[PDB]
């Protein structure tokens, strides 16, 4: 389609400058976007008890650190009990984001569903009434929204339709948060499971990007306006572990061959990487000897956070221990984005934080 | 995606089985799924008050009528708060119908949003949880379901988006409908607005379909459980108006080359056409000199209803004179549904049922 | 796109018209277009050297067959070199065969070349200047075009790229013979070659064949003015066989599913049947008591001429037994174009004609 | 598709490399590659004859240039006459061109042809035995090919047909080339021909790219193994004229958006601009405060010659004086390809370059 109108200056100013303000230099995304079901499961496993105020009481630990974390931390991906909620002297977490400078995000999808006939695969679904959703998220203080499609590798998938049908409600997805002042954070993930090798995996992302753009395209996204959060490229989780060179010059290729230099930058998923995994290969990733015309930094939810349960593990008096394992983490982190960090410097971290069957 | 599977055995029996009962010989559909809003728009005409029970009314007027209907009319299209609604002596409307023999259909869709950066074009929500509403649909006594697109002619439109995402909702609404034993009736309505030709009707027109049927190939929907819905091929509503016989041929024409023959039947919708342009229009195509591999019948609302609604007035007492006129239009359409209406014989019927921009 | 120019009405008529009459009641196509090398292959197996000549003495026992012949034969798809040969006397070939009532057509394509990447797969080459290459053969007498592109079934083949490179190629074939006056028969062959079942097999063909008429709709191709030279659908040549009631009930539905009934007819490929299989297998599917909107019948080449081969041995003396094979088997198909053949009337016929390999 | 193989390491390598030094900083390309017939006009206007060796001589004069041309011209597009002629002394202009260190490229389209039913569009045709001609091209010494597609800008056009024709014969082109050993320049031309705005030029621009790209990875084209060629970005011939700051913007947008950074450079075709518009817009362009990931340069025709033959006039006491021309053009060329030129350094040049009517 030829004819068709670009956003007002206005609303392109905002995008773009919403967009610049969370890949800022040594800054990326805290994800603590977990539903009630998925929050229960990471309280069960140290020893607590998944009630609205054990998860606000985490929450609280989390949007109450030090300010020292804005330095490291642009936005924070919020699930919609949260943005309601308060800290424990009644101060509404949104305000207390805010006063760090911490730019506000929300998960607006309702999860995935099965493509009757396929081999297994889903889309994703949530459009209905998205656009009044994000005027009300919006005038709530969110400025940036997460929409997760999956895509599973598999003898057959992701086939056609999958890639296709995701590829479609990724860019419905994306210019309705626009239409509605909010940058859309585009999360195609390749799923890690299976036996793969480096080459398929390649192969897959290459495929599924290039269909993205497309979609964006066919449905006139601002590209400035918008974020890709894409999985890095690895063998699956049940094969040889590869090199960080070897994960970095796969991903590098990938994006170099698929993402346009217009979008403004690229936050990783950590899918089941530990926590070191995840930093030492998005340092690598900055360290690739080919132009890179995009912010490269990290949109990690457990990599950020499996230390900070173990230590807190449900008791007050170890706030300032999870606290500091975030603050540690983040710095990390916001190292790594800028192809910086030293391997084994931040600690040990955690063990896998893989967790299979997803979408399905 | 050529590794696919198909419906079992059961389902496809029982899928084709419903649309083979819906456009048996001389039958047609009753579209009465207008919403709150629409319902009241038309009982204001009439001078009635739009209160609940005052649909409640009209609705059971035309469900009480005598079941020599049923000879004419396979199945009636609800609106969700009609499903659950009940006669005076208190049966439930459901019941009414289905003893008459009459198949109960739904409507599922979520009305039109605008896709932005278009010029003025839509798409149609209504996606999400429709698996489990259609599961309820069906517990509830519904077998098949409606879902309306709505596709304008203007001096670029419809575009190649509009055509993409149009033929892609319907493809996925399809697949929903059927993997929860719903026939799903595929409704890509062409708008009559604007002063367009009969040429640019077809032309539009064979486009559209093309992309429905590629749409519904690509996401595995079997076709011999569907039926489709389409707009007669006519020129614009403020244009010179063309003879039955042009209508007829521009039409079949138009669904012979893109309508496959595994595709169960056509149910006409009638647009702005009169009660009785309708009748004779639909007669005319039933008597073109083409191979016609489907069922040629209608889906009629305003069409069937007009006479009824102005016999009627709102007084009780006009109750079997209103119930008559719908008698006669449904007899009339059911002669046409087998080429053998002569024009004129039911009466003349209405004025225009043409209510301009329906997309917004 | 929805602006564009259908065929003037006298194009319109003059292919549909051509068209029709190859599908008449009762007749197929024989394909007698052999390239030297392949006709080689075929006189070597009776011990006669391939010259010219002895090409042309087999060429002239064909022709020269009773008029009877066109009773069942309403065309002939010729190899160029044949189109410009004479028989002994020094009439034309091209004359003998019009002066009998016979259409002639001719092969255009120039081959298969590798999709460089693809997993051994193909697309057909032969677009360049064929404009002028048609405007001369239409000249010349013919009347119709074959193009011929291949289809692997494998691992993961055909892929979607293979599927889209030769439906788009068909399509420019198509259009570029129509602007010619030349009706073209579209010609996307699945192979029977591999161990894959009949589930298999009907999934590619009804894939490949929902892109192949998207594509012609693309580029605004007059379906009524093209045949369809499809592959029935059976089990791989490597696979327990199939009864003929299984093979046509998967044709059957197959074509049902995907070709519009615009199309004026369908001229099935034998692949590697033998003449027995063949006709059997043609007959059935005239019998398939589902509605089948187009003619169905045949375009053979070796089906009709491995006996006839076989009786003549190369030898004046056996000119007439040789014609007489030839007679007896486009009886016997003209009989299956009706759905009329019964089983063995026409003899045992030729042992299997399979030959592995097609596209490289 | 996702199953597919990557070119062996050594192609990749051999590719790279060549467009790697295709697009060296200050260096561009001369395309000298113009028909007979073109050729003619050229040399008509002059005031000289169109015969073989007035051509021959002409050539003569461009590449017996001092050696110093080597620093500003990186290589030469020829037309298939050209690379087997000889100098007067009987030197090969291909040995000639190979010591001074330029690379050969080799223009191997055979010319446009109309799409059947559009509305006066085309697509580009020779593909036919495009893989042995290429081998043979690699032989003689061509490392690159050439190959332009025509797009025009009208009421209804490009279609949607058109792009995706153009696309898909564009990947086909760049694949068989690859396959050979030689870098496909893409050239998808957007005609300058019309009265449409900047606005108008940039969405059609950006349209056709991202089909350009979907379609290249839909084939598997090594993307670091390939040049674009496309126009600036630009209003109509017939509107009113930008800014080089205006153009440049727009045409940095237009590639930001759609040009994968994995693609080695940008050589840009002058369209109906003044040799002087020509540089000042390729150094503007240089100048944009975007980031730019591609080597953005000139690939220039009638841009780099128009003075040259001015200045000659077909005497041959004008050699020298050409000659100068030339280098003095390519200086400032390759300077504006580094974003150092200083407008109006180079003299003043040619008027308008433009001549209406590419396609068709």
Chains 1, 2, 3, 4 share one sequence.
């Not at 979008?263 to 000897?289: D, K, M, R, W």
């Not at 800028?338 to 410097?345: C, E, F, L, N, W």
Request: with cysteine; charged share 25%.
């Amino acid at each position: 389609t030829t004819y068709f109108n670009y956003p007002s200056k206005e609303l392109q100013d905002e995008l773009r400058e919403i967009a610049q303000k969370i890949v800022a230099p040594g800054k990326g995304i805290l994800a603590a976007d977990e539903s009630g079901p998925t929050m229960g499961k990471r309280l069960q496993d140290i020893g607590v008890e998944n009630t609205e105020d054990n998860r606000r009481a985490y929450r609280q630990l989390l949007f109450s650190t030090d300010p020292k974390l804005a330095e490291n931390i642009s936005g924070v991906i919020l699930f919609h009990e949260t943005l309601y909620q308060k800290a424990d002297d009644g101060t509404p977490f949104a305000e207390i984001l805010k006063k760090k400078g911490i730019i506000l995000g929300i998960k607006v999808d309702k999860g995935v569903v099965p493509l009757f006939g396929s081999e297994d695969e889903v889309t994703t679904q949530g459009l209905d009434d998205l656009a009044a959703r994000c005027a009300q998220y919006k005038k709530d203080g969110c400025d940036f929204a997460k929409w997760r499609c999956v895509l599973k590798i598999g003898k057959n998938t992701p086939s056609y339709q999958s890639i296709l049908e995701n590829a479609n409600v990724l860019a419905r997805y994306a210019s309705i948060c626009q239409s509605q002042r909010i940058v859309p954070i585009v999360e195609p993930e390749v799923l890690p499971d299976g036996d793969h090798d480096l080459d398929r995996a390649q192969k897959v992302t290459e495929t599924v990007l290039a269909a993205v753009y497309k979609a964006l395209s066919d449905h006139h996204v601002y590209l400035e306006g918008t974020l890709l959060k894409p999985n890095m490229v690895t063998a699956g989780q049940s094969a040889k572990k590869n090199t960080p060179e070897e994960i970095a010059l796969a991903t590098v290729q990938a994006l170099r061959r698929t993402v346009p230099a217009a979008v403004t930058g690229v936050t990783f998923l950590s899918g089941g990487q530990s926590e070191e995994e995840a930093t030492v290969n998005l340092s690598a990733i900055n360290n690739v000897p080919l132009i890179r015309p995009w912010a490269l930094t990290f949109s990690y939810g457990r990599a950020l956070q499996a230390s900070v349960l173990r230590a807190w593990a449900g008791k007050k008096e170890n706030i300032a221990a999870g606290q500091n394992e975030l603050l540690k983490r983040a710095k990390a982190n916001g190292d790594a984005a800028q192809g910086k960090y030293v391997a084994g410097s931040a600690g040990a971290g955690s063990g896998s934080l893989f967790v299979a069957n997803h979408a399905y």
